[PDB]
Amino acid sequence: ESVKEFLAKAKEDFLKKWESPAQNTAHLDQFERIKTLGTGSFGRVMLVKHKETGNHYAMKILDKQKVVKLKQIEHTLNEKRILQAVNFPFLVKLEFSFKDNSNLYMVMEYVPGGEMFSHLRRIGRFSEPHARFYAAQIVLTFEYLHSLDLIYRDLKPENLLIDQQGYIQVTDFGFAKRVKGRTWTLCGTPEYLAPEIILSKGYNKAVDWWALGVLIYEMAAGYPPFFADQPIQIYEKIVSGKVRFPSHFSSDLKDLLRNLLQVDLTKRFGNLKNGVNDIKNHKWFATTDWIAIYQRKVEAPFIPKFKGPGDTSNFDDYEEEEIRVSINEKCGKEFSEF
């Protein structure tokens, strides 16, 4: 019960930051903008250099007016409150946050190895030991998050960054939520949605363990267990729940996946009386040393190739856009707590 003891003290540290969140800890002028590392409906993430220390960071920029328009105000306040409060080896660190007239800014530690998504698509698929190495890190991270009553709700390779030592850093807490009961928001990514989300049932932390099943499948197969050209067709496949496995999947992997990709909440691993230990003690994880993983003592199966200090070869190229800061404050009352 030293996991039990680690988590008790983890919670005391989280709650102190949760109740008194850090706010307005830098300013845009302290950073020089270098390159856009990512951009989509989720916002825009730029490599920046902190002028006074020269440190490199990844700065997420959110347009306040666009957040309001997408009705993502509360989710955005969730994300910053939660991310500034957590502390775990596989969660990206939030170093500073601030806002100006037009934008919200979250300055995170820069993870130079790129997105797992990039390497997975290029390489095709990961071998089972390679996928097991990443999966173990997610299992420990969800154990940590869920003990704080946090639901993550957006696991996918696009949100997992690879650091210089080959370990995972989870990013994007846009859908993360602290909740003790059930919740109802339809959010996530189509391929990763648990059936109870699609069926508008009210759901809990068990949806994260379903998403882990999708991730492990996608890493080991090279494609997700439910895909189609349009989301409506993906949802139909998810709710029937019939998974076919590639012929090269081991017998243990298939058995773990049948228990994670389980429509019946009374049988889904992670959700039962034994909690996460049904997963940690499964046969597929028998060669996994959970303490060595946490301590980062396991040699990683893949090490990113990294040349410079702000080298960005592991990220795609995007059209650089201006960072326009209006002359008037926008949505002041909505984001007062940011």
Partner: peptide
């Protein structure tokens, strides 16, 4: 093959979240 079907699909790039 399933792999061939995936690669020919429209969802091999980065996938956007839904918030519906």
């Amino acid at each position: 093959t399933t792999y061939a079907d995936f690669i020919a699909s429209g969802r091999t790039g980065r996938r956007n979240a839904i918030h519906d």
